[PDB]
Design a protein around this ligand. Structure first.
Ligand SMILES: O=P(O)(O)O[C@H]1[C@H](OP(=O)(O)O)[C@H](OP(=O)(O)O)[C@H](OP(=O)(O)O)[C@@H](OP(=O)(O)O)[C@H]1OP(=O)(O)O
Length: 67
RNA sequence: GGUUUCUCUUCAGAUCGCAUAAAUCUUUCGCCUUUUACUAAAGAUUUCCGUGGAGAGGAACAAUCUGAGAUUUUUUGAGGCCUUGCUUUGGCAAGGCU
């Protein structure tokens, strides 16, 4: 989120250079798309293993003794 | 002596990635009642999204194509011919020859 804010400020301060000001119509999304999808390939297998443990506790039950 | 494409197998040792995330563990911290969740640095590993080379199979389109394949200077007649030594008989070692 800090890198998204920094990319927003970099885009804004490369953009507001001449006659454009701080209006609400600035459009660019590729850098945040890169950041959150590289986060998504990071966060995928931990999510898959946590959801697999969730499904195993849901359907195989909870090992109360267990490990 | 086709191409494109799909699948499988194998080697990935190149920035396999002109890209970049996460997790565990060993720790130092930051934070700090405590548990996950924590902060940012190192070490030790891993996983994921990708990647390259090779081979096989399949499919659709090329249906061949693609290859491979002389007289006149110095690199051709200054060509012939004889005697002695030796014949070792293809002519050889020396002389006058045109
Ligand atoms: O300096 P800017 O890049 O132009 O930031 C401004 C604004 O106020 P400030 O001028 O005082 O900084 C906000 O501040 P920051 O978070 O960037 O510090 C921010 O608002 P958000 O927090 O919602 O992002 C953002 O607003 P937005 O992203 O909607 O454009 C933006 O606003 P403006 O550029 O329109 O003035």
């Amino acid at each position: 989120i800090r890198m998204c804010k920094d990319l927003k400020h970099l885009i804004y301060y490369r953009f507001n250079t001449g006659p454009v000001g701080k209006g609400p119509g600035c459009g660019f999304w590729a850098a945040g798309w890169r950041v959150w999808l590289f986060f998504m390939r990071g966060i995928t297998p931990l999510l898959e293993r946590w959801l697999g443990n969730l499904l195993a506790r849901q359907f195989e039950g909870r090992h109360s003794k267990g490990v």
